Amino acid sequence: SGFRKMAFPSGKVEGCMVQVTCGTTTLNGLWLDDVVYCPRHVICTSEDMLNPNYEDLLIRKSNHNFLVQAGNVQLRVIGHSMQNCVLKLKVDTANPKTPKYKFVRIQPGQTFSVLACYNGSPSGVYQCAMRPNFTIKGSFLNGSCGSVGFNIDYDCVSFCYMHHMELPTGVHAGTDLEGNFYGPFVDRQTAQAAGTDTTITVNVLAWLYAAVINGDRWFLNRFTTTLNDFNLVAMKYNYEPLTQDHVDILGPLSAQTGIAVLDMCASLKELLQNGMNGRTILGSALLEDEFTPFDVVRQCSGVT
Amino acid sequence: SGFRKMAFPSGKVEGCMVQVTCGTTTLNGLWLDDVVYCPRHVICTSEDMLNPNYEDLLIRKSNHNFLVQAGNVQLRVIGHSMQNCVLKLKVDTANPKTPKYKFVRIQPGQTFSVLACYNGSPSGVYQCAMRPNFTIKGSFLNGSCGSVGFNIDYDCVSFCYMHHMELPTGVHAGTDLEGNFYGPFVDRQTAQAAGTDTTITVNVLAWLYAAVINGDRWFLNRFTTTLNDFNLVAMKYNYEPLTQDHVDILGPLSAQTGIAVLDMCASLKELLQNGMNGRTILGSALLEDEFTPFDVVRQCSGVT
Numbered sequence: 057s058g059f060r061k062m063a064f065p066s067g068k069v070e071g072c073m074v075q076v077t078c079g080t081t082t083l084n085g086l087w088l089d090d091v092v093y094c095p096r097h098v099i100c101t102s103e104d105m106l107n108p109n110y111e112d113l114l115i116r117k118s119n120h121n122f123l124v125q126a127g128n129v130q131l132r133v134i135g136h137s138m139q140n141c142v143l144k145l146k147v148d149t150a151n152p153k154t155p156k157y158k159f160v161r162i163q164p165g166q167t168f169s170v171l172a173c174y175n176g177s178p179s180g181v182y183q184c185a186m187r188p189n190f191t192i193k194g195s196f197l198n199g200s201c202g203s204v205g206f207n208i209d210y211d212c213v214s215f216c217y218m219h220h221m222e223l224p225t226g227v228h229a230g231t232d233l234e235g236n237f238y239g240p241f242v243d244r245q246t247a248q249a250a251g252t253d254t255t256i257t258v259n260v261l262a263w264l265y266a267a268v269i270n271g272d273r274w275f276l277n278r279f280t281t282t283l284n285d286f287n288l289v290a291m292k293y294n295y296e297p298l299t300q301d302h303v304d305i306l307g308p309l310s311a312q313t314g315i316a317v318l319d320m321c322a323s324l325k326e327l328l329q330n331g332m333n334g335r336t337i338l339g340s341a342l343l344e345d346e347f348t349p350f351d352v353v354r355q356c357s358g359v360t
Numbered sequence: 361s362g363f364r365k366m367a368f369p370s371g372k373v374e375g376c377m378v379q380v381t382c383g384t385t386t387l388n389g390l391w392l393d394d395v396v397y398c399p400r401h402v403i404c405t406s407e408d409m410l411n412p413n414y415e416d417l418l419i420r421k422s423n424h425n426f427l428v429q430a431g432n433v434q435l436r437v438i439g440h441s442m443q444n445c446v447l448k449l450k451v452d453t454a455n456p457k458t459p460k461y462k463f464v465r466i467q468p469g470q471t472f473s474v475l476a477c478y479n480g481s482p483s484g485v486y487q488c489a490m491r492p493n494f495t496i497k498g499s500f501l502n503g504s505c506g507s508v509g510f511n512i513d514y515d516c517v518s519f520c521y522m523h524h525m526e527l528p529t530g531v532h533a534g535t536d537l538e539g540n541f542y543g544p545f546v547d548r549q550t551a552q553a554a555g556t557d558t559t560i561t562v563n564v565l566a567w568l569y570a571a572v573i574n575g576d577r578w579f580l581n582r583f584t585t586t587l588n589d590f591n592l593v594a595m596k597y598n599y600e601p602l603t604q605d606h607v608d609i610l611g612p613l614s615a616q617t618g619i620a621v622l623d624m625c626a627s628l629k630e631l632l633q634n635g636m637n638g639r640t641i642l643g644s645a646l647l648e649d650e651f652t653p654f655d656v657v658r659q660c661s662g663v664t
């Protein structure tokens with residue numbers, strides 16, 4: 057019992073973190089096999105960031121200009137290439153701590169752990185969701201660029217995020233490990249619209265199931281709803297419309313608790329329309345949307 | 361910018377986790393140097409737990425009855441001893457992944473990371489506080505016993521908690537690494553009073569400073585208070601009385617923000633008396649007490 061915003065154990069990712077320096081700029085890199093991946097803005101000065109021509113800036117750099125370090129290990133750079141907004145620095149040594157890994161592009165609404173790093177050193181780990189508007193609400197300061205997001209299935213680390221930027225609004229933006237930004241963002245110092253965000257309905261419902269499993273049940277009611285009725289309420293409250301695919305993903309939680317998905321939707325509808333009335337659910341005074349139905353199943357069953 | 365419930369990177373602790381089996385019972389152990397530490401109830405059956413005589417139960421066990429495994433590594437047990445509620449199994453091999461470590465007894469109100477484990481395998485990591493009543497509100501299922509809590513300062517892991525039990529109320533209880541329970545708890549299947557808990561005032565104030573640092577300022581007001589006046593409000597709302605030692609620990613945050621500690625106390629007083637009025641602070645709709653002033657300084661400065 058108990059339900060926490062749990063992150064994946066970060067050890068396999070800690071063994072991949074390196075410091076990458078180019079000129080006056082230092083950030084984090086991810087060393088997998090004989091390649092170090094890092095944000096391409098490592099080649100920029102603060103002045104360059106207003107409107108960088110990355111192709112031109114990278115042409116003035118050679119392999120020896122990229123200093124890659126992992127504590128007492130200095131890596132020898134034998135190749136460099138830019139792929140979208142990431143640099144791939146080929147090194148002469150394969151990382152002996154390379155875990156089994158994959159590079160994945162996660163969907164909005166999915167969750168992942170972030171290993172926040174500074175100067176190639178891990179500072180902390182936290183769980184977060186990729187918002188529907190493709191931003192993340194992380195905890196990042198200058199120097200955290202290159203810190204990565206990931207998920208772990210058994211012995212395989214699926215890297216899904218690399219940190220690049222903080223928007224003027226304080227929210228965060230980054231790329232997949234092929235350097236493609238999530239969202240409309242560009243890697244330049246310009247004000248950029250994140251766009252309207254919404255609450256991840258399927259995740260709030262998964263978290264309400266987690267609440268019932270762990271004993272928080274005060275929000276259960278004698279009502280039911282339909283997908284159409286619930287979606288009129290979701291519209292009013294800036295929630296993502298619920299689809300049958302979402303209902304389908306909630307199947308295991310509905311089966312375990314015996315609470316029909318649309319019955320749980322009626323509870324969510326009443327909480328949206330009336331608020332919490334000064335009460336809490338799983339230690340929260342708001343409707344939590346950073347737990348996917350898969351996260352709930354995993355945490356409630358103790359998967360390792 | 362951004363502020364998250366961040367846990368320490370768990371890698372150094374993952375390398376210490378082992379599975380300990382004794383008879384029909386399997387739980388987690390912590391392998392440091394040539395000793396494996398685990399809850400002494402590993403020697404009990406479910407029937408034994410109603411009123412176990414641990415000394416008698418342990419007398420029926422020999423070194424070869426404790427099966428210690430770390431994946432493909434089976435450890436050879438050459439000694440066993442009980443220290444309070446923990447067993448210390450001497451093994452013939454020192455853990456090659458032993459980090460620099462210390463065993464510490466944390467104070468109530470302090471925070472730490474928990475690496476939740478099952479069958480010797482890490483499942484997740486989360487940050488939590490030791491409640492003033494010496495319980496923790498974790499996320500633990502059967503088999504998570506032996507999972508540990510810790511803090512990290514540079515390269516040293518200070519182990520402060522080992523998980524033992526879930527109270528009938530769903531909250532958790534455990535020991536320091538010398539096997540002394542935090543709180544009045546005993547390791548037996550009996551209903552046990554946790555006692556009145558309180559909110560960690562100094563931590564809520566530290567978190568209000570973190571909010572101001574990250575741009576959430578709506579709660580700042582034109583008021584001030586005294587320690588005496590604030591403590592009358594703290595009493596009414598089941599908050600820990602604020603002392604000059606607490607004010608002293610908030611000094612760095614007061615200096616950084618320019619907001620006097622008693623001025624921040626007046627903001628906390630108004631939030632206690634009026635609530636949040638449907639607003640949020642750092643993504644929370646309640647007053648968060650799981651961040652110490654040290655946690656705020658560390659996260660806001662990116663310490664690794």
Ligand SMILES: Cc1ccncc1NC(=O)[C@@H]1CCOc2ccc(Cl)cc21
Pocket residue numbers: 097105196197198199200201220221222223242243244245246361
């Ligand atoms: C300061 C900070 C904090 C948290 N995360 C990231 C940062 N850093 C940035 O955003 C840097 C500095 C500012 O200008 C830009 C512009 C574009 C890009 Cl891709 C990077 C950056």
Ligand SMILES: Cc1ccncc1NC(=O)[C@@H]1CCOc2ccc(Cl)cc21
Pocket residue numbers: 057401409500501502503504505524525526527546547548549550
């Ligand atoms: C089931 C569970 C869940 C989470 N954390 C822990 C547990 N396990 C327990 O509490 C076990 C089983 C029940 O009886 C007792 C009694 C005393 C002690 Cl020390 C241990 C236990």
